[PDB]
């Protein structure tokens, strides 16, 4: 009890991980909520330590939205150093209700944890295949940054969702300052802000959940206040600077949206978050720098996150040169976690539409074209054209050989069309 | 009497059941049904639609889908059926959340869960189109789903078939492999059931469809073309293929090939709506020999063909043969043709290429995909407008109906989608 | 076409089912949201119809909370005419997170539909076992009335949850006028009311879901306003009579709680629900009568529901004569749906504690006492002592027999210890 | 990598945990299958260690079947030292297909691990409540012994199910020598044996999964050979003594069932299992002695498990005196793990039938009778009377107060009927 608490307090005081982070609660409070034993969360712990290190040693970390394990595995094979788990993509195509939803927190709260677990389990299998074949060359255990939306209710829903993300092996979790019952994609209308004090309580709840689980999980504070021109309540005096006095039929207060409202929220959330994220209506370098300088005046060195959103028309907003240089340029402002939220959705839907249309028009000629493009990608590191090997048929054959002392008559890769034709 | 007679009339009077053996009575089926009939709308409409299409179209060709979005794009592309691969579910979409090879390792309710997801995505697509003021596209295309070797015995088959129907499947395939040693048709190590056991599984499948009251399509698959092992020598009709050699596990070695496959194909034909012979390559003359063998006994019998990504197509066939393949086997009676792993290869190839591009060139790579999407809108692609695609418009209308048009928090007005697209 | 619209509009205006019910939307609105086909929901339709007839047949329907199919199956065998599906019980022991939770909407939103479906599936198996053996006497297809709490967010979460309840085969669903993010058990402190207008919109959302599904599901409007002394907002002029002007640190408004507040909400909800339910702090005939009289002054004949809560200390509140007559009496005021919310939780916990303690002290003598109690109950309609039969071993023996033309070697009941010893 | 191999061969050579246990594979093979990292499984490891220690320090460990976390929690509160997780109970009322099934391996293979996980999470919450209130008196983390049936297919299905059990935090797992596609309850007809070699390969597969996961999980080897008079294959020479030559229409071989066939299987499985279990058709002391004496001839001090089955009519088979001493008496033969498989089913079904029938006849008088019985049980350590506390309402109140720095106006136990009336 003494030792357990003293060790926790010692970690908060000495570890540079917690520099500039406020905890408005004690080590004794955390140990009181932990129960009588510590449960180890190996992937969550390893991932969060690796992510913390990468954010401070890489020029920046660029990720793509992944909604299956296989998408994540190809992202790691292409050389990306983190996976982004979009709640938008989970609403669309990968939630535990099995419905297609817009991005309005309509799906079950345990849906993103479930996909974190799936992704970690695919990466484990990929690691096992590689390890079994004699190398540890590729590091398949890359950090997953997951979308917790507005936490699917109040501060206790936030607490439970943060714990579920850690249980599943997420390295980082983002929370946004929206009223959960009205939650929207950052690039839709009808965004309703929480009071500053409530959004702060959600970030404190996420940190308390991480502390109870015993894992230094990365917390990303997102503000929707650049575009949001509604707030649930006028209760917080710091929000009254932006309130016009008009009320909607629902009782929401209208506000003066813009960079001033977002900077105010960023500065409020910075002491309670590892990274700050400002949603924007277009990919604008000047706005990104303005936001960055505002945070950096009060919290120099504060890590920032940037949504390179497919909700933008990139060629409409930016010239070819500006597009090519965009990520390197914003990284120089402190945007060290950068992610294309819906890359997985667009990859999956475009790929299948074009394939199925080709197939409809030209039958097996369209499918052979795809198989040939796959053979052509092998020299750049693609391996999935050998699908039996990719999903672990070789790993399970070796399991069977260890079980039977190498006598099994029913191993799968020997006598396969893969070994004959590939 | 009323329920018995009604069922009996269907079996005897309907064209649907021409050439189909049921070894049990209508009275057997109503004894197992319970006191009420539960309707299965998507299962019934899909099975009716599939049966009609298989008789009106030259052929029906499908691709594997492992998500509702993949299925939705297949429909928008103009395909008339969806294939639900168990291989794909093993690989990336099963209820254990693990990546597995194709050896019946995932939980048995996994394929039904994906059937239900695809039907719910199609339902949403239909809801969006209907709200916007058209019923142009028929989103309710039939799903043909993989039941593997039934994940156990005759009772596991019965339960799985019911699960497929509950989820809204139009058709279901079962193969003549030992469930505990199940393999992908193009993997080694395959073990056949005795003919009599494989026939009992098909009986079990039909009895499940009959209990649920739905005319579900049943595809009987044989793995006897390459499978050189059988569990048992119990069945006298299997004797001709059994060598007498046994494996250490006690499986009996058989002489595999087209003769063993034709024998099972003829045994299964009275108990299924389509017969499917797994092959080791896309060989027109073998396809023709199998078809002629079946049709010799059962003229007009519908057949199914796996246009498998487990074949190296360029290596096996010239451009001309690849171009004509589906229309050529359709002329032998292969009216249901499917690329089992199309969803896997589309998803994996697509993401690898985007991710490598992104790794090398950041947003130039993403912008290239976005520009390709915009161009693809000129031949019917819509997913560029991602907010509309997923039903943001549908939920805006629901909100406006609930609030009588007073809602201050609708999504599409003020979106970047409306301003930039 | 335009007929399919006119028919729906006619049924609302003319069918007895919809007497006294307001729909602020049109038939054309519902058909616009239904898509191109109608999907059949047999158990949800039949059970809603049977629940409506039952409410006009019996003096009252008294139900117990069930958290498993087997509990619901025994409730039917004991002669009860509906099943109550408690969200409290799902929180505690039967939700899709697998956690034990207090009753604060912490669990995933699809959890109660999952349990509705489980209970319907057990009841289907019971009916199959009876049907196969040649009886159709017991009606196993009793209506389920399910807890949708405060809808797990906004009006769209309400819409989706109500659709989930109908897909699962619920006959009725209840919704309460609480802020979802602060949801509590009716007998906990810290309850926050919605504005009257928001609570009404939630009821409108639930009816629109049931109309879109094409099922006449029973909707129960619950008010928490008897004890709730907080409201989210003063936006609704009809709530201003109860609002003191004091505010909490979170920005909630203090209200004067009591029967007057509860009556105001009951009158406001009555046109938008089939039954009205007033949560109470104790089982008091006079208060039950005042509430029913107040409703019936404006809505003569309105069906009411009453929670016979295990959260009450019954012996502390009522003498034994008053306990024995309670349901008979409040039924005469119009409380035609009565339920013990946590019956299942208390039955399962108490029975296992008693069995485990006896077993700890006396080994198999304690287990043999239960088994002898079960044999003694068979005279009264209990059958589960023959566990193999109860769970449908005889049904599956008959499936195997039909499949094999009566040649199976591996049927279960012949050669069982059940066949030899029971 | 040398260190990972070294720590494994050091454990196998030095630790008496592995006395008498044969592993046909190498520490090298285990590390080649594990992958590049070690994942910690705290509850599986602590549970298996606790279970191993209990089986050596106590005369016996007696358990009851539990199918919910609440049942398991009351078993612990009553003073039981292990929890039995019955596959039969999961088939009946707690599997992931949500159907009521006989005990024939019809449900999804991940169902029992899902219930292991639920029970551990319930025990964790009870630990958290006790810890917060300021003691660690009760050890809630009692070991769970879980039913893996016949492994839901071949040796790879066994391998996956064992890993699933360990991931969920099971302390022990049982596997039976039945053909999975024909699996029956031990007390049903139509059981079919695997050949000895195949049964042994399943046990090898289980041990390899535990070694790969890095946890010393208890493996129980069950034989159905006392009553099973069918086998799938005559392939194994050690089985020819029992095979008659008679076959069934399905191709199964008739065998001479009885204690000789069971002793043969028990001796064959002993080197591959930590406990051996012989299914019996009645609770017969002489048969239990004869089995123990035949195993101990070759494996002195081998731990044995005994099913105190509700499939037996206990009063038909034994006198009052014999029932009362039965567990003590078979414990002296080496039956150190004793469990009543279906205690959860009979407790749940009997209790709810009795309550619903009393509720049917006497309304709230019947419910008040249960509530007063519950109050009477408090002196013995029953706490569920106070249901709000039991499920962690006070835990989540203290979480809310920590997040809000003590400023929350919405905590749940303050103003509850539980604080007012109990």
Order of helices and strands of chain A: HHHEHEHHEHEHEEEEHEHEHHEHHHHH
Structural class of chain A: alpha/beta
> Which pair of chains has the greatest number of interface residues, and how are they split between the two chains?
C-D, 129 and 127 residues
**Regarding CATH, which class of chain A?**
Alpha Beta
Give a nutshell description of this structure.
Chain A has helices at 2-14, 27-34, 42-57, 69-77, 87-93, 111-133, 155-168, 196-213, 259-269, 285-298, 314-317, 320-331, 343-362, 364-377, 387-390, 393-404, 417-421; strands at residues 61-64, 83-85, 144-147, 172-176, 218-223, 230-231, 243-247, 253-255, 275-278, 303-307, 335-340. Chain A is of the alpha/beta class.
Give your account of this protein's structure.
The structure is a homotetramer. Chain A has 422 residues and is α/β, with parallel strands linked by helices. Chain A has one domain: Phosphoenolpyruvate-binding domains (TIM Barrel). In chain A, 48% of the residues lie in helices and 11% in strands. In chain A, the strands form 2 sheets. An 8-stranded parallel beta sheet of chain A has the order 1-11-10-9-5-4-3-2. In chain A, helix 1 crosses helix 2, helix 4 crosses helix 6 and helix 13 packs across helix 14. The longest helix of chain A has 23 residues. Chain A is globular. Chain A starts with a helix and ends with a helix. Chains in contact: A-B, A-C, A-D, B-C, B-D, C-D. At the C-D interface, helix 4, helix 5, helix 6, helix 11 and helix 12 of C face helix 4, helix 5, helix 6, helix 11 and helix 12 of D. The PDB classes it as lyase.
